[PDB]
Amino acid sequence: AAYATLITSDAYVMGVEALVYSLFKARVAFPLVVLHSSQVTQPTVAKLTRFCAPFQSSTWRISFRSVPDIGISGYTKLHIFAMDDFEQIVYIDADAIVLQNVDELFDRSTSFAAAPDVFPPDRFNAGVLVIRPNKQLFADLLAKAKELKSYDGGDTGFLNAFFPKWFESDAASRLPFGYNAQRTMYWLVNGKNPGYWNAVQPLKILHYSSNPKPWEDKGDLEILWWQMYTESRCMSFLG
Amino acid sequence: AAYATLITSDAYVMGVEALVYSLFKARVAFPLVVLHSSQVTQPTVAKLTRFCAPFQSSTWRISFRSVPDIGISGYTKLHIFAMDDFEQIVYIDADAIVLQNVDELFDRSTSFAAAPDVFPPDRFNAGVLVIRPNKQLFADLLAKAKELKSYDGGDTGFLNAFFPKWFESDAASRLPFGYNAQRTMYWLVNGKNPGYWNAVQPLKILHYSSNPKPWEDKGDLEILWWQMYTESRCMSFLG
Ligand SMILES: O=c1ccn([C@@H]2O[C@H](COP(=O)(O)OP(=O)(O)O)[C@@H](O)[C@H]2O)c(=O)[nH]1
Numbered sequence: 222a223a224y225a226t227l228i229t230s231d232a233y234v235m236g237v238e239a240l241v242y243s244l245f246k247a248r249v250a251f252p253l254v255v256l257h258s259s260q261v262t263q264p265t266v267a268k269l270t271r272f273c274a275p276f277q278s279s280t281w282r283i284s285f286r287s288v289p290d291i292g293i294s295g296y297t298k299l300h301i302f303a304m305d306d307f308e309q310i311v312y313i314d315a316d317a318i319v320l321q322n323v324d325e326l327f328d329r330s331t332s333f334a335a336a337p338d339v340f341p342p343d344r345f346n347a348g349v350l351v352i353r354p355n356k357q358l359f360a361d362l363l364a365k366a367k368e369l370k371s372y373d374g375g376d377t378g379f380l381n382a383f384f385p386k387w388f389e390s391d392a393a394s395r396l397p398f399g400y401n402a403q404r405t406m407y408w409l410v411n412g413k414n415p416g417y418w419n420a421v422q423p424l425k426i427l428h429y430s431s432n433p434k435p436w437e438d439k440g441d442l443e444i445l446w447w448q449m450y451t452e453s454r455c456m457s458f459l460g
Numbered sequence: 461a462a463y464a465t466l467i468t469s470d471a472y473v474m475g476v477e478a479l480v481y482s483l484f485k486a487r488v489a490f491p492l493v494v495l496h497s498s499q500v501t502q503p504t505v506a507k508l509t510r511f512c513a514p515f516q517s518s519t520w521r522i523s524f525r526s527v528p529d530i531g532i533s534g535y536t537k538l539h540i541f542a543m544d545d546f547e548q549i550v551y552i553d554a555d556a557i558v559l560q561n562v563d564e565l566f567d568r569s570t571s572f573a574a575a576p577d578v579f580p581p582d583r584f585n586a587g588v589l590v591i592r593p594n595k596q597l598f599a600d601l602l603a604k605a606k607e608l609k610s611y612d613g614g615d616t617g618f619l620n621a622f623f624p625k626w627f628e629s630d631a632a633s634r635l636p637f638g639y640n641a642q643r644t645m646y647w648l649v650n651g652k653n654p655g656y657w658n659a660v661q662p663l664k665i666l667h668y669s670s671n672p673k674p675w676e677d678k679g680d681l682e683i684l685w686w687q688m689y690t691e692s693r694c695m696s697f698l699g
């Protein structure tokens with residue numbers, strides 16, 4: 222079992238660093254694999270590998286894996302389904318941070334789990350996926366991605382077309398919102414109805430969906446992201 | 461089995477009339493019970509009973525039932541759980557309209573079903589409920605409503621505190637969004653991402669949540685509500 226994340230552009234390296242460190246703080250008991258695609262230049266990989274070295278120990282390994290891009294690079298995320306040297310992968314977008322240990326995600330007995338999106342709430346968001354690799358399933362996702370249109374133009378829209386009955390699936394396959402709390406909801410409800418956000422408990426993974434990404438630019442949640450990233454620099458360089 | 465709706469103020473009579481007529485157009489094969497509470501004056505009841513008379517036939521009965529208010533009138537909706545001369549009730553808010561026959565809602569074998577809210581998407585909205593009356597459950601809702609706080613100040617927040625594990629329940633108890641398509645989502649996504657709304661298919665019940673209510677005041681969905689209400693006047697008075 223492993224955590225995985227993904228970087229397909231140099232610019233997202235800071236998101237990966239914030240995420241890596243948040244997993245270190247949470248003391249996750251499972252290794253992490255960082256997938257990087259062709260468009261990520263080698264210096265950025267080396268910089269990221271250096272950043273991560275002080276968090277390596279006998280009890281937690283961070284490893285790196287080159288993966289090829291998948292165009293429509295928008296589908297590069299599909300590679301997790303081919304990572305079949307692992308029985309189970311918990312995948313987290315690089316624009317997310319872990320606030321609390323989520324090791325219990327690996328106790329779900331299902332081949333595919335995801336949390337609801339906000340729009341519409343009976344579809345899932347592809348930023349947090351608990352999957353069991355299956356190279357045959359991977360081959361079918363590759364094929365069907367030349368046939369199925371996505372309602373949001375990206376991997377979330379595609380994966381919902383490939384799994385249109387996710388809302389009907391068992392509770393193991395449907396993660397509570399606190400495992401993928403998208404800031405878009407906070408943006409929309411904080412000024413008027415802050416109680417809607419406070420009802421998301423426990424809040425374990427904060428997802429910084431939509432744009433700009435916090436490293437591309439000061440709301441309360443963005444402040445929380447900068448708290449985590451800058452602490453990660455102190456601990457990497459000075460710890 | 462019956463459809464039920466609720467009016468607790470004179471001002472909502474137009475919402476009830478739009479809803480009644482939309483159920484007539486959809487040719488629902490189950491009778492409708494309109495609950496009215498103390499605050500609704502008798503003339504408004506008589507006017508509503510007159511409005512509904514041309515839709516009475518040997519094959520569809522609309523009936524009226526006086527119910528007492530339940531304060532915190534915000535909980536008056538809880539009366540559906542005491543309507544135990546019916547095995548099953550499909551409850552619909554008066555600020556909703558039915559676009560397509562929903563008779564299949566009565567085929568769900570569950571005691572309680574509801575559709576997700578948008579905020580957060582793992583809680584349910586109380587505007588469309590498929591329930592099995594149970595006077596004992598009703599007594600407990602009455603009692604627990606003097607103990608449990610609601611995160612939205614109303615019946616939706618209360619019912620989610622009373623049923624906190626709804627998201628984990630089986631598919632029978634979790635209605636697709638198209639059974640309670642709240643216009644708040646359309647308001648929010650139409651200008652930027654209209655494809656999010658178009659992905660809600662089939663769209664069978666349109667819910668005009670938030671304020672103003674369309675009869676209290678011209679977007680595309682409000683135009684759709686006025687199309688239904690004014691047609692209902694023509695058919696009532698002239699048909
Ligand atoms: O320019 C990009 C776009 C995407 N990604 C990777 O693909 C994931 C999904 O894209 P993104 O999170 O930006 O989309 P959103 O969540 O806003 O829909 C990101 O988190 C990264 O892991 C990336 O590395 N660089």
Ligand SMILES: O=c1ccn([C@@H]2O[C@H](COP(=O)(O)OP(=O)(O)O)[C@@H](O)[C@H]2O)c(=O)[nH]1
Pocket residue numbers: 465466467468469472552553554555556587668669670671
């Ligand atoms: O002033 C009111 C408020 C509520 N209701 C009834 O209670 C339901 C729930 O209230 P509402 O739909 O206005 O709330 P919202 O959907 O905006 O949260 C309404 O649809 C009506 O059936 C009513 O008749 N008059």
Ligand SMILES: [Pt+2]
Pocket residue numbers: 314315316317348428429430431
């Ligand atoms: Pt993301």
Ligand SMILES: [Pt+2]
Pocket residue numbers: 553554555556587667668669670
């Ligand atoms: Pt409503």
